[PDB]
Amino acid sequence: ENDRRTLWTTPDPSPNCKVSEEKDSKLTLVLTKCGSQILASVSLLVVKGKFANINNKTNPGEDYKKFSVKLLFDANGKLLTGSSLDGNYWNYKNKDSVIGSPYENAVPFMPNSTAYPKIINNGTANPEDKKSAAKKTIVTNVYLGGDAAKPVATTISFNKETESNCVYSITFDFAWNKTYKNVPFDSSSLTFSYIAQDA
Amino acid sequence: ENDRRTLWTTPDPSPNCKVSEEKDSKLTLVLTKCGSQILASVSLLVVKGKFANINNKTNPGEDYKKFSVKLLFDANGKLLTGSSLDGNYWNYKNKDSVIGSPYENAVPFMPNSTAYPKITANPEDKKSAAKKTIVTNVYLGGDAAKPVATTISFNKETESNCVYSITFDFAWNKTYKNVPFDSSSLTFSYIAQDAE
Amino acid sequence: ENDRRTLWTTPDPSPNCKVSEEKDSKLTLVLTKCGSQILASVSLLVVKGKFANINNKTNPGEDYKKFSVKLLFDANGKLLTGSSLDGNYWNYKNKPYENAVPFMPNSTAYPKIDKKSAAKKTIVTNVYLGGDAAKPVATTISFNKETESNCVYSITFDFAWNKTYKNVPFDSSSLTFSYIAQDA
């Protein structure tokens, strides 16, 4: 029904995502099918490791000021091992939790291949032949502790990844230049949409 | 029929919202159920009072450079008195207006309690202030040059004895001169409560 | 089914849009009916002409630093000739006619015009050239702003920038937005 229209991490998940070390972050990600598009809400809380309490006064150097979170999917839209996200409670919605057994197909939640193809290569190619690197991307900000003063550059990228031997991918890249002092990585919620693959 | 999926202020409301004084603003808010989430559009036009013509040259102090708008809901998703918004024309859609009499239940439009709870030495147990928030900008007169910091907050409020809450907090640092508070439209989504 | 709920340019279009000269850009626009609202994604790639390789070092003037893209619709939500977008591959998902009032921006919410609202008809945001944080472009989406041809409805994408970009193709990041829909 409306349960099988949503593919999520529970709305209040247990640590389920690797940012620096195993299960160091809670990624809340909801994918809902509104017709041909996926409406998505995402937020990220890191609870231990490198990013659990950002301090770029004591750690300048860019590896403490950016990180990414990859979802990698196979042909059937199943979630692959290289993924930042743990697949245990990443499944179709069931009344505020998930379905019993793991899901066998989720292609209709995948970013559309035509709209977001995995390589783009311009030159030798006519103008009428050219494709869009940028189209594959949403560039926005999230705000740490929900504070306007603490922005984090956020690029969501569709089918950017080749890791494992994935067909589909959603990649959240976070980065900042402010030198934050004892700021937990606790993101504001972020709404976005992409064009869906057909079955 | 398909109109039971939408809960709105109507698309063209009469002044229906307190910002500084009684019915001084028109709040346009549409809530639509897309599956497990609420797709929402909001805009705010203030037509009289403190914010009808911002001038922080003549009033520099902070209280003339920020304000909030609270929607407070009970257990059944009915609107409480503490709310900034008047309940008279806030109801399920009917063909570009609203249904005749008020409805008593709208829980499925409420911000999810699990995702956005009211809230601790332990990191791995702790819950997220920020998750409950969307931080963005609206633009006065729809002008890129006139930004307004906008925080939407789910279940932040305790006023009256509300279970659910949507809070629009506006603030600015630019000292605007004779700029009406006329916001650009703002799309957002939140995860919805389920109705047992 | 949900085919008739989507009105798009197709997800990977052939050049289909005038920015400066005929068919000089690929406009990707998806409109989906989620209840009373339209959920939309838009992105623009210009492939030839004035904006195919922006350089405001060599062309500083205003006309090289902004442009708009107009969709003009009649009473039935059919696409009119004055439009920036070519009508040939602008149709319901899986292909052909438009008769598509339910995808139009609501007249009450967004009229042609105590007080009334300039802003309400507008969404003001940024897109990013090449998907690069460093290359912002001021973007205003406007509903029923246009009078060209004899349109009833209109969607207008206005892009503008002040940064002096050097050999930057106009390749926009995707942009999600919603508006209140007209009833049939």
Author numbering:
A (entry chain A): 395 to 593
B (entry chain C): 395 to 513, 518 to 594
C (entry chain B): 395 to 489, 496 to 513, 523 to 593
Text taken from the publication that reported this structure:
Here, we structurally and functionally investigate the tropism of HAdV-D49, focussing on the fiber knob protein as the major mediator of cellular attachment, and evaluate the potential utility of a pseudotyped HAdV-C5/D49K vector to infect a range of cancer cell lines. We investigated the tropism of HAdV-D49, demonstrating it uses a novel cell entry mechanism that bypasses all known HAdV receptors.
This search revealed that the HAdV-D30K protein is highly homologous to HAdV-D49K, differing in just 4 amino acid residues ([Fig fig4]). Residue 338 is not surface exposed on either fiber knob protein and is likely to be functionally homologous (HAdV-D49 = Isoleucine338, HAdV-D30 = Valine338). However, the remaining 3 residue differences, E339K, G331A, and Q332K (HAdV-D30K → D49K) are surface exposed at the apex of each fiber knob monomer ([Fig fig4]). We further investigated the effect of the opposing charges at residue substitutions 339 and 332 ([Fig fig4]) by modelling the electrostatic surface potential of the two fiber knob proteins, based on our crystal structures ([Fig fig5]). The surface potential maps reveal that whilst structural homology was high, they present radically different electrostatic surface potential distributions. HAdV-D30K is significantly more acidic (pI = 5.57) than HAdV-D49K (pI = 8.26) ([Fig fig5]). HAdV-D49K can be seen to have much more basic potential around the apex where the residue substitutions are. Thus, it seems probable that the interaction requires the basic electrostatic potential. Structurally and biologically we demonstrate that HAdV-D49 knob protein is unable to engage CD46, whilst potential interaction with CAR is extremely limited by extension of the DG loop.
